[PDB]
Structure 1
């Protein structure tokens, strides 16, 4: 309600009739994936990140409307240094759009991969980013919220490479741990998800796991999944290291000249604790926060 209500044809323009070409070459479309497509725009002189929702999977009306509702609803209460900022939205012209503040460095995912040829993130920059992400999450768990879709792709970077969590559409209003809560409709990103999450069980323990996957993604500079790589899953490296088959040293990203063993292995151990298969044998976000704060 405090968020500004745009009209659809107020922001179809700024997005350049939603120009499907990238910034690289003329057009607007910055990022795809999820349940829409994120374009750039220009309002109040400034740049912004617009997201036109669209039905790729889950082809049903109110579903995407409720995730839209959820996105907004969450963003109302939740505000933090390590969370994105919604400026407004657009429901009229029934194509659900969302206007945010522009993050000039986009996803952690992309900046690890160096998509469009960006410089490789130094160890030191990542350390901060890992701490930042963990902090933003802690706020959600404090404000009793589960994200249900934590991944590099949903962790974005401002003008100073500040980790800010994004996409609270699948986020769930939670309790302490009432008792074990469930869904029939299971949703999330497979390579990142916790086992119980993959069994439809909902819990703030499940977002800890997936952050483990990010902390690895960071250390290795390898995504959680790749259909042309053995092992296809990053996750599987844990057991490789856990069976002394290789060390973490072997997997440390080589696109860095500022990495050291102590910090790396500290960030490994933390990441492994998150990825402990017993949901309840894992540490809580705050314990993680601490561990990362201690690392430096």
Structure 2
């Protein structure tokens, strides 16, 4: 509940003065998003993940997300969610300290970033389950994630799914905003129009399920089709099948359970929010799959 307050200068030292070069070329950079850069850190015998908030066009605004990340982190602690260890305010330089995830993000593991071997269909089902449980806990606690994507599903040594990035998270199937925030490749139709509903989180999870099946990122500029959702259309319009897209980097994948995960994904991806299943139903269908 109550978080440790680190001083900016402690964090600078622990991250080799926020060395922005990738860990692959001897830097501290593990990844980046639109609102910040994540660094590897070594605080008091603990390897940590330091997210330093930054405009990658946002104002501050940034501080609103900082207060929101801590507020949700204080109330939401669970087996399938990341754990915040601390924070740093000092001027415009805002940092959040997390538990270091040895298997990084689902997005990076599906693309085998840095020579990691491809994920077994067995681990993929475990991840899908864990990721769904984390969303259930957030919803049961009247919270909408708003940024469900494979980059925001982190993995430990045992490949346990851990939902991250709560900077956009909101306490709660029809609320309204103005100013649309999130990742468009994953965003539900209603979400792109201002609607704040837990049903949007489910849609996004369907996009994640297709990435899990195919090993393909939601959007790829140098791919035909660019969008993974266009391949969902091709399946539903008999122009192609799910087998034509099952990740070729698997051997333990059986069309039986693969078609089952696709069935769940298809329901998650219903155009009309009320036709989509709730998180508890998604959980049921995934536990039924194995």
Per the TM superposition, whether the score is higher than 0.5 is: yes
| Cα distance, 1:94 vs structure 2 | 2.9
* Distance in 2 separating the partners of 1:254 and 1:60: 39
Match of 1:207 among 201, 206, 212: 201
Looking at structure 2, the residues matched to 186 and 2 of structure 1 have their Cα atoms a distance apart, in angstroms, of 31
Contact 2:131 2:163 in 1 (8 A): yes
Provide the alpha-carbon RMSD of the alignment. Answer: 1.1
Give, in angstroms, the shift of residue 61 of structure 1.
4.3
Question: d(CA) in 2 for partners of 1:147 and 1:180?
Answer: 15
Q: TM-score, normalised by structure 1?
A: 0.96
> C-alpha displacement at 1:180, in angstroms?
2.3
- CA drift of 1:62 comes to 3.6
For 1:34 and 1:158, how far apart are their aligned partners in 2? 23
The 8 Å contact of residues 218 and 229 in structure 2, kept in 1 or not, is answered as yes
Distance 1:171 1:102 in 2: 21
**8 Å CA contact retained: 1:8, 1:93:** no
Report the alpha carbon displacement of residue 34 of structure 1 after superposing the two structures with TM. 2.7
In structure 2, how many angstroms separate the alpha carbons of the residues matched to 1:93 and 1:201? 33
Alignment equivalent of 1:234, drawn from 228, 245, 255: 228
Q: What does the per-residue CA deviation read over 1:126-174, in whole Å, with 9 as the maximum and x for residues that have no partner? A: 0000000000000000000001110000000011111100000001111
Match of residue 265 from structure 1: 259
Note the alpha carbon deviations across 1:57-76, whole angstroms, 9 max, x for none: xx454411011110110000
Aligned equivalents of 1:72, 1:229: Cα separation in 2: 38
Contact 1:145 1:172 in 2 (8 A): yes
User: In the alignment, is the contact (CA less than 8 A) between 1:219 and 1:252 conserved in 2?
Assistant: yes
Change (3 A) 1:60 1:239: closer
Q: What SS does the aligned partner of 1:30 have?
A: strand
Aligned residue pairs total: 290
Note the C-alpha offset of 1:25: 2.0
- What is the deviation of 1:27? 1.3
Q: Which runs of 5+ in 1 are unaligned?
A: none
Distance 1:246 1:21 in 2: 41
Deviations 1:238-277 (A, max 9, x none): 1100011111000000000000011000000000000000
Give the conservation status (yes or no) of the 8 Å contact 2:50–2:97: yes
Alpha carbons 2:202, 2:279 under 8 Å: kept = yes
Unaligned runs of 5+ residues in structure 2 are: none
After TM superposition, the structure 1 stretch with the greater mean CA deviation from structure 2, 20-29 or 187-196, is 20-29
Distance in 2 (CA, whole Å) between partners of 1:190 and 1:21 is 27
Secondary structure of the residue aligned to 2:87 is strand
Q: Does 1:225 align with 2:219?
A: yes
Greater shift in the superposed pair: 59-68 or 33-42 = 59-68
Q: Which residue of 1 aligns with 2:47?
A: 47
Give TM-score scaled by structure 2 length. Answer: 0.98
Runs of at least 4 residues off by over 4 Å: none
